[PDB]
From a paper:
14-3-3 proteins interact with many phosphorylated proteins, with differing affinities and cellular concentrations. Drugging the hub protein 14-3-3 raises the challenge of selectivity, given that 14-3-3 binds several hundred phosphoprotein partners. Inspired by chemical crosslinking and reversible covalent fragment-based drug discovery, we developed an approach that we term “molecular locks” to rapidly access molecular glue-like tool compounds. These dual-covalent small molecules reversibly react with a nucleophilic amino acid on each of the partner proteins to dynamically crosslink the protein complex.
Numbering used by the authors:
A (entry chain A), C (entry chain A): -4 to 231
B (entry chain B), D (entry chain B): 546 to 551
Write the structure that this text describes.
């Protein structure tokens, strides 16, 4: 670990500076170093970890989609042969993306999830496990595609089970988990009806619980509810 | 637009 | 060179794919590999090289400015002591930025400039040399600051001399060179009057030559003229 | 706004 000589608190401080500078690769490396100190992460620290890697992998995924679309067009009839370069470069980006997902999944397995006992931390990390297996599924084409998809499903399902038992229906982690598991159903698992049902039930149960919230909590929950509503409008 | 994840 | 085993044409093809995917670090590495093949660059290839590195160094410069501003605030009176982390991270970004500038300047010195005989290539590369010494000057604070500034000035001046002898006043390279040398005067060399005079003379001489241009060339030249006008409006 | 370079 190249961050092994830096203090935990300094890694966290630098992760926050990296966020301000929009240096998300640095942010992710600082937060990886902080995780590898072996202590559990606070709520704020968990969100720094997720923001960092979401931005890194988000850029890789967008690049992969651009290259995959060019590669698909090259394989249409009447397309001029251009050589192996598009496939090679798409593969290079794909391998880098898979490496980042494997890094995140490795941090969760060694040893964030096994030490996470509170609902807020455990659900958060299981959502992350589902998300990063989902990103692996987006690029999978081979013999393990079904197992990758089932790994994402299983992680999301455990997170859902805990969130429904331990969290109110307006909790932003619960809402964001449902948002993403719904998208998993729609576009990974070929289950658009399940995706729509999950988004609708999640939205409706949150609606009914808004009356219990402070103004600030209401703002937090309604923001994610609007994402669920947007997806429902797109899909129906 | 495109679907949201978070 | 990690690109040493890839064909020149494949490096160029991948640089264009990297641009489409907004993967500017990859784009720069592909174009560095293409330069190191030892052949001169076409006009299109020169612009791929410059676009790649301008995006890479542009992100580093923006991050450096964010961190430098935080560091300056930390040193104001009444600011709480936070340790060495802000300075350390600003220094890390600074060293990376200087490394990219040194890489570009090394490509120009070995051996792009010495083989560039046509006005369009020679002016283009000398503008690049001035630009990358200017980016070094932005972060310089020590005994070599004056020599770094003079290296930028000297490169820009040679480019200006060639451009005035060999290019029409509407040529987009000549215009962009003048735009940047004017900014050098304003914010590096503490010469705002020289900056304003250069921008005004450049704009006025281009104006008078627009009548010679096709519609497409007119569009190319007037776009850069508007940048000169914008700077003049900001500065007066 | 900020000054332009290219
Ligand atoms: Mg310690
Ligand atoms: Mg054909
Ligand atoms: Mg592959
Ligand atoms: Mg615990
Ligand atoms: Mg060859
Ligand atoms: Mg105080
Ligand atoms: Mg330094
Ligand atoms: Mg020559």
């Amino acid at each position: 670990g190249a961050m092994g000589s830096m203090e935990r608190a300094s890694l966290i401080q630098k992760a926050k500076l990296a966020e301000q500078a929009e240096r998300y690769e640095d942010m992710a490396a600082f937060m990886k170093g902080a995780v590898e100190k072996g202590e559990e992460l606070s709520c704020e620290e968990r969100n720094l970890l997720s923001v960092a890697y979401k931005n890194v992998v988000g850029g890789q995924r967008a690049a992969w989609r651009v290259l995959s679309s060019i590669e698909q067009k090259s394989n249409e009839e009447g397309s001029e042969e251009k050589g192996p370069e598009v496939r090679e470069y798409r593969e290079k980006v794909e391998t880098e993306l898979q490496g980042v997902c494997d890094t995140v999944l490795g941090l969760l397995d060694s040893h964030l999830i096994k030490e996470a006992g509170d609902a807020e931390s455990r659900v958060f990390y299981l959502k992350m496990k589902g998300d990063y297996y989902r990103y692996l599924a987006e690029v999978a084409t081979g013999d393990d595609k079904k197992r990758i998809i089932d790994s994402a499903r299983s992680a999301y399902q455990e997170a859902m089970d805990i969130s429904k038992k331990e969290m109110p229906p307006t909790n932003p982690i619960r809402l964001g988990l449902a948002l993403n598991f719904s998208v998993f159903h729609y576009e990974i698992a070929n289950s658009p009806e399940e995706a729509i049902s999950l988004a609708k039930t999640t939205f409706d149960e949150a609606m009914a619980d808004l009356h219990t919230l402070s103004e600030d909590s209401y703002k937090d929950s309604t923001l994610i509810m609007q994402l669920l509503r947007d997806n429902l409008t797109l899909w129906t | 637009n495109e679907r949201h994840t978070c």
